[PDB]
Design a protein around this nucleic acid. Structure first.
Lengths: 674, 99, 49
DNA sequence: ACCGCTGCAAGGAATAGGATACTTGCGGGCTATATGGCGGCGAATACCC
DNA sequence: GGGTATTCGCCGCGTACCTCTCCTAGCCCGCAAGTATCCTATTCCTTGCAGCGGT
RNA sequence: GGAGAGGUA
């Protein structure tokens, strides 16, 4: 299910976006051809030929609730196309320097160790899940190839995502490439530092942090060691973006939780080291980054099959209720775990903890927010990590990926102003073990709730199942939209043309940087070969009822490049389907003809009842001497049409006769070819 | 229903095709009796009794040209277009008169 | 709209319907005229027609 | 009087709201294609002698 | 070139009243009306530079 | 004001 849902938004570059409205045939001059219905604003029906199928793509903006039905002739699509092309100008120094070094430079190849890697495999004190082991294989094999590696490890939370990272880091330190990992938080930075120092407790590998918990002199010492490269694994927050980290040899960058970074930052780290093997980790991406994830400019990987006993956390879309807080805190405390209490208001977090401390007398409560002393907050996480207090009156600073498997109940007192992926990440704060996790989300009155968290709560409640990390991601795309494909503002539609259009603008920029073709050489329209013999050639609707199969087979016709493809297409059609129609076999042979012309030059052909015109190519194989021999032996049938065209006068009455003449005609071409 | 015909492609061609259900005209309807209403003043259209389109051979029964001569003329009267007359001159000629 | 509204509104044949009887209504919906476009004029026709 | 450390401002991310100039349907207020009627009569042509 | 002759365009073709409906097509110009987007708030995360004890 | 339509004498 990735194409051809009816009523789904669907894009055509000339006119904008519409909704799919079926497939039919129409008689338009004796050729009752097949055309697709597209609906626009004011019910504008557009019928599209099957040959022009490639002018139709899935809408990449999501926007399933509301998408712009461009009224026909409204020119807004043209204006947005020109605006995007202005943004897609190859003078753009944001990525054309990357494409210049793509046209001028290369990358590093990691070498694999078949023996020492087994020792660190035995240093892994668990069993890898099947869905994570293949992720390890995909990560490590892509390390062992020479291009600048770029992979996403978007899996479910607590599934050992750190394990894939430490395996990749172990291969990288087996080549000593000064691994630079990057999380957007000092708290989980310190947590992962503890993970690194505990797991890598045997090897001569230097694992250090540069962050705020290292002082202005300690972090200075650590960055000096980075400049001398004696640190093998560096752990840091956005401190790394301050133009001050300089590895003597940087080979592996490991981004974790890219959803909070901002593409300005993700390219700030990227523009330093060219041949770095970039690694990207998250539980959920940005919908813009999710779109470029599924469209496959970079790699994709989903993790499932939970490690031991991970569970469906009970989503509680409940009102702000003190007795609900009572029952949740008591049931969690009798279970033995700790409680989260999200507040997200520093100006009232002291008062909220002060009232809640006497509101639950049996709780142990402290305060956590990111506007007090960082060592005091370090003391707070020291207490909560070591189970020193159960209920935590906190801001949304707990959404920083903190592990704490003992916690199994989270209470969000106000679910108003929080995104849905953030809600899922907060749902990932409880569980991670065998004990049951509850997820209490206290809300204000549903009228005084919001305009959007009604949707967010019905999404977070209806989605509680195994594998919901990408389902909520496919909700996040088309509730907040994919932003600008290069610039900022990744949430919002941002005039979403489509990542498929990034292919064509990038290749036109490649033409521009080819130094002989301009940006004015923008090959927007490239049919690149065209033939016509004037028959109705279709997949018949009574023959093929499913429009989905029909369009797919049309795509097979389009993607056909050899005759054996045609052979297998025809035999699968006879296999699964039986009869071999006249227009179907014709268009099969027409695709064969286009295969011939691509094999044999031919820019353009036209044919009719009396003949037609051939348009040759330069780097061709057309026999000139044989051709003028053909001319001087049948002047009745042929005349020149320019130096590169040819009008042929042929008694093309019977459709079979047309078929034979063109078939044997290009056979004649193929014999004496030059 | 509007087509695009691909000009570079030869005689008989479609690049694209569009249609929409466009509103046009205001045709009055007929009541259950037969009255029309134009502005609250119910009118009715009588039936005209016009000559049939076709051909008609006519004469002037000794009435013109002071000669007692009949002038057999003939009309091709279309339902739409130009009238074609063929008239005998008094000197036995044959003349075409268009409209 | 012009070429229909003018035909129904102001023609020599789309005439006002006299309505003081059922009988006059009936005999004014079955009138057979000779006037108007495509036909002769009232003051300039002979006896035989 | 010289220096390493705390804390209080400075600048990115994520979210509400009002503004504001774009974008446009409209309505008033202007300019600019024939074919069913005859009798007579005098003036303009047609015509050969 | 002169009588005749034919055409041909213009002239005309009842009086008085009563009832009803209907009176330019289209174009332009700005003028009200509705909108997406940008400056203004708020209040997490790292920076940066000055206070600052302390000697 | 002028067109059109129908009607009386």
């Amino acid at each position: 299910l990735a194409e051809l849902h009816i009523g789904q938004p669907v894009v055509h570059l000339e006119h904008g976006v519409g909704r799919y409205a079926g497939m039919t045939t129409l008689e338009a001059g004796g050729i009752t051809g097949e055309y697709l219905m597209l609906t626009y604003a004011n019910d504008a029906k557009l019928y599209v030929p099957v040959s022009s199928l490639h002018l139709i793509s899935r809408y990449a903006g999501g926007a399933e609730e509301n998408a712009p039905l461009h009224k026909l002739g409204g020119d807004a699509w043209s204006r947005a196309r020109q605006k995007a092309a202005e943004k897609v100008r190859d003078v753009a120094a944001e990525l054309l320097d990357i494409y210049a070094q793509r046209a001028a430079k290369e990358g590093f190849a990691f070498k694999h160790d078949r023996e020492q890697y087994q020792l660190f495999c035995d240093s892994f004190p668990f069993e890898t899940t099947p869905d994570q082991a293949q992720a390890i294989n995909a990560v490590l094999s892509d390390m062992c190839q020479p291009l600048a590696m770029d992979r996403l490890v978007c899996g479910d939370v607590g599934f050992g995502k750190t394990e894939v990272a430490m395996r990749a880091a172990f291969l990288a330190v087996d080549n000593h490439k000064q691994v630079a990992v990057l999380v957007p938080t000092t708290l989980l930075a310190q947590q992962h530092y503890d993970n690194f120092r505990d797991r890598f407790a045997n090897w001569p590998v230097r694992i250090e942090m540069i962050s705020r918990f290292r002082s202005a002199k300690e972090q200075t010492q650590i960055l000096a060691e980075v400049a001398e490269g004696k640190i093998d694994i560096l752990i840091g927050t956005h401190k790394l973006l301050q133009s001050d980290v300089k590895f003597k040899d940087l080979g592996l960058l490991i981004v974790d939780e890219e959803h909070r970074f901002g593409v300005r930052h993700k390219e700030r780290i990227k523009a330093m080291r060219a041949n770095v093997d970039i690694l990207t980790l998250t539980a959920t991406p940005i919908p813009r980054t999710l779109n470029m994830a599924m469209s496959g400019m970079r790699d994709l990987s989903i993790i499932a099959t939970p490690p031991a006993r991970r569970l469906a956390v009970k989503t509680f879309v409940r009102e702000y209720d003190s007795m609900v807080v009572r029952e949740a805190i008591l049931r969690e405390i009798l279970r033995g775990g700790q409680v989260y209490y999200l507040y997200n208001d520093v100006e009232n977090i002291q008062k909220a903890a002060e009232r809640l401390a006497e509101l639950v007398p049996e709780a142990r409560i402290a305060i956590g927010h990111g506007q007090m002393r960082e060592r005091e907050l370090e003391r707070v996480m020291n207490d909560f990590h070591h189970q020193r207090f159960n209920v935590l009156v906190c801001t949304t600073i707990i959404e920083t990926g903190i592990d704490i498997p003992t916690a199994n109940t989270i209470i969000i007192e106000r679910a108003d102003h929080f995104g849905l992926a953030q809600l899922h990440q907060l749902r990932g704060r409880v569980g991670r073990s065998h004990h049951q996790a509850y997820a209490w989300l206290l809300t204000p009155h549903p009228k005084a709730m919001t305009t959007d968290a009604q949707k967010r709560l019905e999404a977070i409640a209806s989605l509680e199942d195994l594998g919901a990390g990408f389902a909520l991601a496919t909700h996040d795309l088309e509730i907040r939209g994919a932003g600008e494909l290069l610039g900022e503002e990744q949430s919002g539609s941002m005039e979403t043309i489509g990542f498929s259009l990034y292919m064509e603008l990038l290749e036109n920029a490649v033409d521009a940087l080819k130094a002989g073709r301009e940006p004015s050489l923008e090959d927007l329209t490239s049919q690149q070969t065209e033939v016509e013999l004037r028959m109705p050639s279709l997949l018949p609707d009574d023959f093929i009822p499913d429009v989905n199969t029909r369009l797919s087979f049309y795509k097979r016709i389009a993607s056909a490049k050899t005759e054996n493809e045609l052979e297998e297409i025809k035999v699968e059609l006879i296999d699964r389907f039986g009869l071999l129609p006249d227009p179907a076999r014709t268009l099969l042979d027409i695709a064969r003809l286009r295969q011939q012309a691509q094999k044999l030059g031919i820019r353009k052909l036209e044919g009719n009842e009396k003949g037609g015109v051939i348009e040759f190519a330069e780097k061709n194989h057309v026999n000139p001497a044989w051709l003028i021999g053909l001319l001087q032996k049948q002047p009745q049938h042929y005349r020149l049409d320019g130096p590169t065209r040819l009008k042929f006068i042929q008694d093309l009455s019977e459709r079979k006769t047309r078929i034979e003449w063109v078939r044997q005609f290009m056979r004649e071409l193929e014999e004496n070819a030059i | 229903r509007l087509v695009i015909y691909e000009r570079e492609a030869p005689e008989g061609t479609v690049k694209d095709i569009k249609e929409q259900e466009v509103y046009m005209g205001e045709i009055p309807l007929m009541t259950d009796n037969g009255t029309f209403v134009i502005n609250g003043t119910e009118r009715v259209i009588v039936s005209q009794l016009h000559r049939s389109p076709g051909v008609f051979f006519d004469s002037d029964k000794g009435k013109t040209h002071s000669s007692g001569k009949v002038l057999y003329n003939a009309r091709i009267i279309p339902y739409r277009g130009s009238w074609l007359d063929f008239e005998f001159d008094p000197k036995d000629n044959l003349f075409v008169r268009i409209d | 709209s012009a070429a229909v509204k003018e035909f129904f509104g102001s023609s020599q044949l789309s005439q006002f319907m006299v309505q003081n009887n059922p009988l006059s209504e009936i005999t004014h919906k079955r009138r057979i005229s000779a006037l108007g476009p495509g036909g002769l004029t009232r003051e300039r026709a002979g006896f035989e027609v």
